[PDB]
Amino acid sequence: SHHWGYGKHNGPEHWHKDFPIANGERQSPVDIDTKAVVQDPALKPLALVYGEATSRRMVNNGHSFNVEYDDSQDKAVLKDGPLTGTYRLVQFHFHWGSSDDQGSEHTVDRKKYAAELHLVHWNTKYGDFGTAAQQPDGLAVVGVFLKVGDANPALQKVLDALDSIKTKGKSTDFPNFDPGSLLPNVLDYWTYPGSLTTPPLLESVTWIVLKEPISVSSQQMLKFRTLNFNAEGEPELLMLANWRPAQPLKNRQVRGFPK
Numbered sequence: 641s642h643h644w645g646y647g648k649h650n651g652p653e654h655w656h657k658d659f660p661i662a663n664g665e666r667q668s669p670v671d672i673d674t675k676a677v678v679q680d681p682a683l684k685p686l687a688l689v690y691g692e693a694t695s696r697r698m699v700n701n702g703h704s705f706n707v708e709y710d711d712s713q714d715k716a717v718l719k720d721g722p723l724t725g726t727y728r729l730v731q732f733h734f735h736w737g738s739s740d741d742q743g744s745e746h747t748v749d750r751k752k753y754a755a756e757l758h759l760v761h762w763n764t765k766y767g768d769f770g771t772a773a774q775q776p777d778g779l780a781v782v783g784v785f786l787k788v789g790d791a792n793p794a795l796q797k798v799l800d801a802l803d804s805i806k807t808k809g810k811s812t813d814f815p816n817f818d819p820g821s822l823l824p825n826v827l828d829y830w831t832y833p834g835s836l837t838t839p840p841l842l843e844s845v846t847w848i849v850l851k852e853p854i855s856v857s858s859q860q861m862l863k864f865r866t867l868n869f870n871a872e873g874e875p876e877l878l879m880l881a882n883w884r885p886a887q888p889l890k891n892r893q894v895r896g897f898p899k
């Protein structure tokens with residue numbers, strides 16, 4: 641039902657068994673070596689059209705939680721940046737570690753943040769997220785680093801719903817949440833072709849990792865680790881860590897905007 645996980649017996653190092661692509665040529669995340677970042681005059685500023693974003697529910701997916709958005713129409717889309725076309729926001733989720741010194745999937749010159757936010761979008765040229773996820777130009781995910789420091793009020797509404805989705809599969813109504821409240825003021829970004837960091841690990845993601853992190857308090861981070869990987873009736877298993885480590889960059893180029 642979701643055999644893969646982040647434990648020693650089913651963690652990232654074993655995903656390749658059920659998902660051979662785990663050892664693919666465009667796997668994410670990757671460490672971003674700023675010294676090797678390339679400047680592409682063709683890159684444009686990110687166009688996050690989230691004004692009419694309509695959040696629906698928060699769901700415990702068995703490895704983290706998703707804040708789902710109505711992607712039935714172009715209510716909240718991602719355009720420009722390194723993209724061609726329109727990409728609808730379908731859901732966002734986070735990745736975190738068991739301690740504040742780790743948790744982010746992408747790293748900056750080996751630097752790890754406490755957590756990492758992923759805003760998932762899909763190319764409207766495909767009719768649906770699933771079909772989109774099968775094409776290299778199908779998905780666009782904006783990664784946002786959460787840096788331990790000042791408590792972040794915008795993160796409040798999210799943390800408050802966690803006690804309502806403790807176990808795998810549990811969901812809760814989660815209306816009127818502005819996804820843009822989780823974005824930094826400066827939208828400088830790094831971009832490279834990659835994949836979803838969780839199985840099926842499809843290589844259809846144009847990664848857009850923001851250079852500027854947003855804040856989160858150590859106390860707020862404790863909150864993320866209170867969730868359960870398990871379904872009610874199963875042994876309790878806390879969601880202490882759900883990040884995939886950096887994967888081989890291989891023949892990929894990380895571009896940076898504005899540089």
Ligand SMILES: [Zn+2]
Pocket residue numbers: 733734735758837838
């Ligand atoms: Zn993710």
